[PDB]
Design a protein around this ligand. Sequence first.
Ligand SMILES: Nc1ncnc2c1ncn2[C@@H]1O[C@H](COP(=O)(O)OP(=O)(O)O)[C@@H](O)[C@H]1O
Lengths: 526, 533
Amino acid sequence: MLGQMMTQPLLISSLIDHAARYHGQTEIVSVETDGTVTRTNWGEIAANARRMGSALTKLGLQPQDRIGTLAWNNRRHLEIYYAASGAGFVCHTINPRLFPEQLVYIINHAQDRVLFFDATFLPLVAAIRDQLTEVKHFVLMGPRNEDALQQIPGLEFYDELIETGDTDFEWPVFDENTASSLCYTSGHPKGVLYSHRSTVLHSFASNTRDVIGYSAMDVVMPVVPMFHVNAWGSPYGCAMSGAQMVLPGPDLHGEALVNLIDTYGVTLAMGVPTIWQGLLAHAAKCGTKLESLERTVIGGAACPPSMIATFREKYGVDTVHAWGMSEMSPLGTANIPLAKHRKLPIEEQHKLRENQGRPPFGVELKIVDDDGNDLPHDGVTQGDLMVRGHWVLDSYFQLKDQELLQDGWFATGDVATLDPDGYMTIRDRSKDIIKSGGEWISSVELENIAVAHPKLATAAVIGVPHPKWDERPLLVAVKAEGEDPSEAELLEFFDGKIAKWQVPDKVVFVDALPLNATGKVLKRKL
Amino acid sequence: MLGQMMTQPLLISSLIDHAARYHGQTEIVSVETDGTVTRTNWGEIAANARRMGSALTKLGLQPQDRIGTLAWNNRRHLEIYYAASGAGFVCHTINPRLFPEQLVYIINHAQDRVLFFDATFLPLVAAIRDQLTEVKHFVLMGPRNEDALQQIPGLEFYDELIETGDTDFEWPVFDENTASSLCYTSGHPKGVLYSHRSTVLHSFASNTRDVIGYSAMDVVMPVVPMFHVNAWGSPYGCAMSGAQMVLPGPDLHGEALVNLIDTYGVTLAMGVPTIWQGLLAHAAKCGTKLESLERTVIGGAACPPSMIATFREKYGVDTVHAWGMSEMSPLGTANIPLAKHRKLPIEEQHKLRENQGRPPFGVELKIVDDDGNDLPHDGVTQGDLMVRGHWVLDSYFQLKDQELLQDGWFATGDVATLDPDGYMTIRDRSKDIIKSGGEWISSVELENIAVAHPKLATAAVIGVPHPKWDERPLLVAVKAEGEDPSEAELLEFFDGKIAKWQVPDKVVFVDALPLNATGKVLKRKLRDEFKDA
Ligand SMILES: Nc1ncnc2c1ncn2[C@@H]1O[C@H](COP(=O)(O)OP(=O)(O)O)[C@@H](O)[C@H]1O
């Protein structure tokens, strides 16, 4: 027997409609590439998104065609998010800091039919343009620019394309499991293809109070890029709650960020540690209080504890350490305390804020041993982190037969501990660990010693099996030009640079490593 | 082309599993019927829920059979919530304050096969038992009690039935649009048949900051009964967040509630206005500061503005005024500020927290006129309030094809304004609005002015017939403790706050307002009692 409630698909276009309906005047600030600052609002972004969704449809694109972006956090990128997905296309956010050969691969593999880009990346797009066979419209995210048209003959312009859209466009209605957007990971990059369902449930979860939780009273500054992992979902979550937004565009250095916070009264800022280090450096120099800032979200790389202490003690700002990855849309955990934590001594309360955090409803975590078996969640045993839930991927884009999931779970590639309350601690990368009995050994830490040897051009380190220690490191070295180092002096080089028991057991000389389409397939091991 | 994400049904059983995995030691306090206090936790509620779900599966029940409850807010009720819905049955909470004859109607119309009930209602179930012929299991929520076995032959006992369930029961996996739970709302009462998907989506919305947002650090005390729209969703939202809970049991008078707040450190409490009058009344007498209380959710009836002021001014407690209905499972609107409001003068800011609030993502509101056409959302025009969304009902139980919706909207029966910011103001239920002269009078606006008088503890305004004006407002007032206002000064208190012709013509004094089964003023019996003068 089914329930008797209204049923409605969980569509991304319903988020922007809600912001337009009940928060249409709520202010959104957009730092443009030409130095301009746009003052717009959710209502205007919704109208532009609808009109651009019509304009995209009138190009004759097919349902779920990919729409690529190479763009900063700005109002036109926010509009494309809703325009592409809302109209039933796939919003494909591309990282413009990648190497050109990586962009060529991603754009062609995704088969973006449209490529929106910001003016910053005009030389970059012009350079790879002739390798981008499948792209039918190149669109600068601004108005007609004659120098731009010189670099890319045939270029189109956002501010002209949008005027071709019908002003009374109606979002189509489709199955909520329809593909919505696309983000590639760091061999080649692999694309994770989100649905409207997974996006919307992820925003729901992120909008809860113990995860991030956007309020309409917030001024939210996503410094995390919209070009990677959806800016942690904040373009979706801030629409759900009608939060104010400050989109910082290309100027992400410390002085510009501190000025955005103080000029617009940012209450919630989201970034990664390197960007925050620039912000904290400037703030300490100019003596600002960051008066309006209440809390920050830091994810993407391990949040340093002394950064948490700085925000807390200099500024009275709480730091949410959050963890995730492209494959989880991105949010996996967030470090918020539990009730029982108020009764610990204040200093123990501070160290509890340091790990990657606890998972919200909708995501489940476990750690497994090297044969796939569950390990206790005692906070001390280390295992391969496995995840599943409503916004974890099932398979990579154009790669379904590769049996990604293991017993319905996704292997993150991280080694972690998990305590009984699900607080997770990244410890290592599964692919980097050689499981020498007793203490494990990092392969890259051994490589970085080895490649620094002046008589070695390069070298690789692999775990190779051993009858007593299970897995032991082997050094695969290629001698520097005109040099002939002995095995003994290469291993002697490790003396004092690392514990003796981690030194590779044997040296093997190759004249070259066997390359994949760029890196080294050390699965040989043969 | 579909996405390539894991897809899993939105099941109520994943809420309790999540709480057991990651909040398994988070504490839940349960005031029991006998007079005892159980200290348990989500891990324990979940293990008992899993095992009760096994035991109910072994009774032979068929998928989505109704499991009825007549119960207070306590650990066993919470366990049944998850045991029943998790096992694929329909958790049917029944209000034990209805007349026994209404209960017979409801239980037969819903065809409950199992009837869990607290010891408080042993007499009442024994009296109406012979008219509940489709109930196969009467389960006292407690251990074997031979006196109980006396009043009800064949009576089974919760603490015996649960031990029949496997300790390793795996929840079944079924369509998220499967019926999960049923609540009757008031001709005859009608059933609202919720689904697992609607339930989980409503829990997601209630857990946002600007609605309620239960935190793992909250101590949550729902005084709202788990038989009134599932205690406003809180057994689901709290499980989703792993909040601590205080389940108050049978004693909901002010002194009992004050003691629970101070004894267990309640941070967030939720209830209809009348339960907050007793609490605030007693708190003023004993002098408590309600130290742990941070927040309150007050809805079901209009929160008096002076009640909001008291919590804010006297306790530093912020009151979230919220509106909803059984048909919206229940959340419709919640009153939280917008950023713009922080610039306004401080008392325009207090003023904006008085209305019923603004809708969250998942809910849509509009008002329509008597012909059904849209009305401006200008904050002043009045119309019939209409709703649609992910947790709004499509049709009533056993009444699937009866043209309930108007162009896909559900008609709430409330008269309201809606402002351009989406804030909703209840003018009145359609049934209580007063038609005096040629214009409508909001009884709700009138009573809340009267309640604010410092010499009244509470008050109600009702329309009574008048030979010239059709009907006229009557002030039914309750004198505050230590106060003795005259009729005239209560009437003069209205001057300037409302049009002259809207001031009630007369005051009558009563010791208490008659309350219905959800603690709302029974204005119908007030209109009967005072049909003269
Ligand atoms: N904050 C509120 N202010 C005024 N009325 C309210 C409020 N919240 C709920 N209600 C009223 O209660 C109604 C919903 O429930 P009701 O009709 O009393 O039966 P039930 O609560 O069992 O659904 C609403 O339609 C509205 O009339």
